[PDB]
């Protein structure tokens, strides 16, 4: 962490990729981090798609509000993610739409 001497979002992304929450809790979130504007919400979006409950809770505990974070576009991006565990949403979408969708079809909220 201290060897990279990079910005706070880079250290936070490293800790998110390692799935080490206590390191971010102690080393990262300290007195006067001076977070760049839009960094915390980007980290929340990255933590959602990777299925990190602890990091989502930690980011919520430090100023990130879902009432401003969540939009239609971000929810749409959440529903089309790939960096997560297996799910049967695509098969249900295909069955509802009767298999007419082309490959790599872009899901929309109306489909949900």
């Amino acid at each position: 962490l201290k060897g990279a001497n990079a910005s706070a979002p880079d250290q936070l992304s490293l800790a998110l990729a390692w799935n080490r929450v206590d390191i971010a809790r102690s080393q990262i979130f300290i007195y006067g981090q001076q977070w760049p504007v839009g960094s915390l919400e980007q980290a929340m979006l990255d933590a959602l798609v990777l299925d990190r409950v602890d990091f989502v809770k930690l980011l919520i505990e430090n100023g990130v509000s879902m009432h401003r974070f969540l939009t239609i576009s971000r929810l749409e991006e959440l529903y089309n993610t790939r960096h997560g565990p297996s799910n049967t949403l695509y098969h249900l979408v295909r069955d509802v739409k009767k298999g007419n969708l082309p490959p790599d079809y872009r899901i929309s909220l109306i489909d949900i």
């Binding site: 006067g32 919520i60 505990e61 430090n62 100023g63 990130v64 509000s65 009432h67 401003r68």
Partner: protein
């Protein structure tokens, strides 16, 4: 100008919820003027908010600088203050803004609600100009969402969460303090004169707790001790600032070379007159320390001072 502000009616009073925090909390808020009589404020506090007369009143003073407390001190202090305000029904007067010791008591309340029931009526009397969002609260008698997120360059500190009630004092300026101190002292004096339920004839006792602070903390402690009904003062040594020098002066009293601290200003100027006055009226002062002397609990330290 010479305080040339028109006395328009208040247009910001109701309830606010703190969004972005790690909890869901509600807090009544009313903005008022610096000339509001203490009896009127007490009427609003006991009638519109449904708050009974307390059996204990704690005043907390500190430094507006965002200082830092050592481990094992902030935990013990927080739990002692919380226990002293929870076992006995009490009001905790604070600065209100999220700076310094007020952030510490906010975190102490954060730990308390994590693992205990009940509600602590903590009242934060803060100036109106220093809040980050003077707007976003102008909805009268309506809920207004509030953002706990803050930025270093805002120059206006957000209101600390985990505070049950607020009172905002306005004199006109923005970014300048010293608009509520007289109101705060008059409110404390007016509450102290209120009779407790007992028929013996004693008012609601008032205690003062000092952590960190700065040059003004000595003046405030001296003003507290010189009032005709004396107000006992409890000081924590481990903070480092003028609390520590008060703890030092509590020892080996009735060493001027030992009075070279130089944290305020140049060595040529000193407040040794008022410090000697404080050491002259040192029977009312009670100092908390860990293992060095008695009262290892902050809760036992505060109660035994009354």
């Amino acid at each position: 100008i010479s305080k040339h502000t028109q006395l328009s009616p208040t247009d910001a009073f109701g309830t606010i919820e703190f969004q972005g925090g790690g909890h869901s909390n509600k807090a009544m808020y009313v903005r008022v003027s610096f000339d509001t009589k203490p009896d009127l404020l007490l009427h609003l506090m006991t009638k519109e908010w449904q708050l009974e007369l307390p059996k204990l009143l704690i005043s907390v003073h500190g430094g507006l600088q965002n200082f830092e407390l050592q481990p094992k001190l902030k935990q013990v202090f927080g739990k002692g203050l919380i226990k002293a305000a929870m076992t006995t029904g009490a009001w905790i007067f604070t600065g209100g803004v999220n700076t310094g010791v007020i952030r510490h008591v906010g975190d102490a309340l954060k730990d308390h609600a994590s693992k205990s029931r009940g509600k602590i009526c903590t009242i934060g009397i803060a100036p109106w100009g220093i809040v980050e969002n003077q707007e976003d609260l102008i909805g009268r008698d309506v809920v207004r969402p509030y953002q706990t997120m803050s930025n270093p360059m805002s120059k206006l500190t957000v209101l600390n969460s985990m505070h049950s009630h607020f009172i905002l004092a306005d004199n006109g300026t923005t970014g300048k303090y010293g608009a509520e101190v007289k109101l705060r002292r008059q409110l404390e004096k007016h509450i102290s004169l209120q009779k407790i339920n007992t028929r013996i004839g004693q008012g609601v006792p008032v205690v003062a707790l000092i952590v960190e602070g700065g040059p003004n903390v000595i003046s405030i402690v001296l003003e507290y001790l010189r009032d005709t009904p004396p107000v006992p003062v409890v000081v924590c040594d481990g903070s480092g600032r003028a609390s520590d020098i008060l703890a030092f002066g509590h020892k080996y009293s009735e060493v001027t070379i030992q009075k070279t601290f130089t944290y305020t200003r140049t060595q040529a100027q000193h407040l040794f007159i008022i410090l000697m006055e404080c050491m002259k009226k040192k029977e009312l002062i009670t100092v908390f320390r860990m293992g060095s002397e008695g009262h290892q609990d902050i809760d036992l330290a505060i109660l035994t001072a009354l």
